[PDB]
């Protein structure tokens, strides 16, 4: 799941990612998003940020001291 999501994120593909990755057929779990979420903040792709926030991500949990320090 993680590699497929990363590949889809490499290009600006919103609807394809929503349909294929978050179809709900296979549970993805919210904690797994963190890594890719960080990349979305560096690639300057707000729509994937919206996807991650709407798909169960806890933004406050993501903004850990280490994460903010590095960012």
């Amino acid at each position: 799941w993680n590699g497929q999501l990363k590949l889809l994120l490499e290009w600006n593909q919103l609807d394809l990612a929503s349909d294929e990755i978050f179809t709900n057929d296979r549970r993805w779990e919210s904690a797994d998003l963190q890594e890719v979420m960080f990349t979305a903040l560096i690639k300057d792709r707000p729509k994937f940020v919206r996807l991650f926030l709407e798909n169960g991500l806890n933004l406050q949990k993501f903004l850990t001291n280490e994460v903010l320090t590095e960012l």
Binding site: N24, D25, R27, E54, N55, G56
Partner: protein, 290 residues
């Protein structure tokens, strides 16, 4: 006073305020439970809008689903209807709790949530023991113990009501959105009681399957298309059970109302619920010719 009665009716009850909570037994009679709840906790409800969602924590919040459920909560508040839900603090349940909080911040909404005692690990037995840490925080009358909820729903439907018209029977509509097996079983058992159920085909995989349905090969193809992983992981025995449950569901076509994807107007949930209740009242053959 009330606690003393509860001691004999049920002991081992914990009230938490940060939010009343109770310990439920299968042998517990729904009639006495409803009588006590009306006596001390809440008032008689003109309507009951139950929600069926997969017990799995994983969920997806689409904008259309969010708007639909916000409209549902608004309608429930306007009509003062009870809401029955699993209440495990995940996905749709968490969104419902947040919506209830937002509505109440801006005359009260009942969000009774029935869950399983075993499924939740933390124990905070009692007087008003309060603990933090699965359970939801925004629900008002969560209680811990499928069969119990159906029994309570049928008892409430049988109970006569002096208001809300509907032939002295409370609407008690059943609402089911999303994809799952337990939601299939809940819809089937609700249909067994003739309660009108409304479904949304926008997101729910099994909900979309049923919406598209309205033979065995067709059902298998639809569920494979909409549940590839579930179909592949599901055993051979479970396939026959699912097929029979869905076929029995399709037997009562009139009760099952569906929401169309084309509809995008503000008033969609109210129209669907009203149409379902009208179908149920007209086609029941009892006090329908009036």
């Amino acid at each position: 006073d009330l606690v003393n009665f509860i001691q004999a009716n049920f002991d081992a009850f914990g009230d938490i305020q940060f939010g009343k909570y109770l310990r439920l037994s299968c042998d517990t009679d729904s009639e006495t439970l409803y009588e006590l709840l009306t006596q001390h906790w809440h008032l008689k409800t003109p309507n009951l809008v139950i929600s069926v969602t997969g017990g799995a924590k994983n969920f997806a919040l689409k904008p259309r689903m969010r708007k639909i459920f916000s409209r549902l909560i608004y309608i429930a508040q306007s009509k003062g209807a009870w809401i029955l839900t699993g209440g495990t603090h995940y996905g749709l349940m968490k969104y419902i709790g947040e919506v209830v909080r937002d509505n109440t911040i801006s005359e009260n909404i009942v969000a009774i949530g029935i869950a399983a005692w075993g499924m939740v690990s933390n124990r905070d037995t009692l007087f008003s023991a309060q603990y933090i840490m699965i359970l939801d925080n925004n629900h008002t009358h969560l209680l811990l113990v499928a069969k119990l909820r159906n029994q309570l729903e049928k008892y409430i439907s049988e109970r006569t009501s002096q208001d809300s018209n509907y032939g002295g029977k409370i609407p008690i509509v059943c609402f089911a959105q999303g994809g799952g097996r337990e939601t299939l079983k809940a819809i089937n058992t609700s249909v067994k009681s003739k309660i009108p159920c409304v479904v949304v085909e926008g997101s729910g995989q099994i909900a979309d399957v049923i919406a598209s349905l309205v033979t065995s090969s067709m059902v298998k193809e639809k569920l494979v298309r909409f549940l590839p992983r579930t179909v592949s992981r599901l055993p051979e025995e479970e396939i026959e059970s699912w097929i029979k449950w869905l076929k029995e569901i399709l037997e009562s076509s009139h009760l099952l109302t569906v929401i169309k994807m084309e509809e995008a107007g503000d008033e969609i949930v109210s129209n669907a619920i009203s149409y379902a209740l009208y179908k149920a009242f007209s086609t029941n053959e009892q006090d329908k010719d009036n």
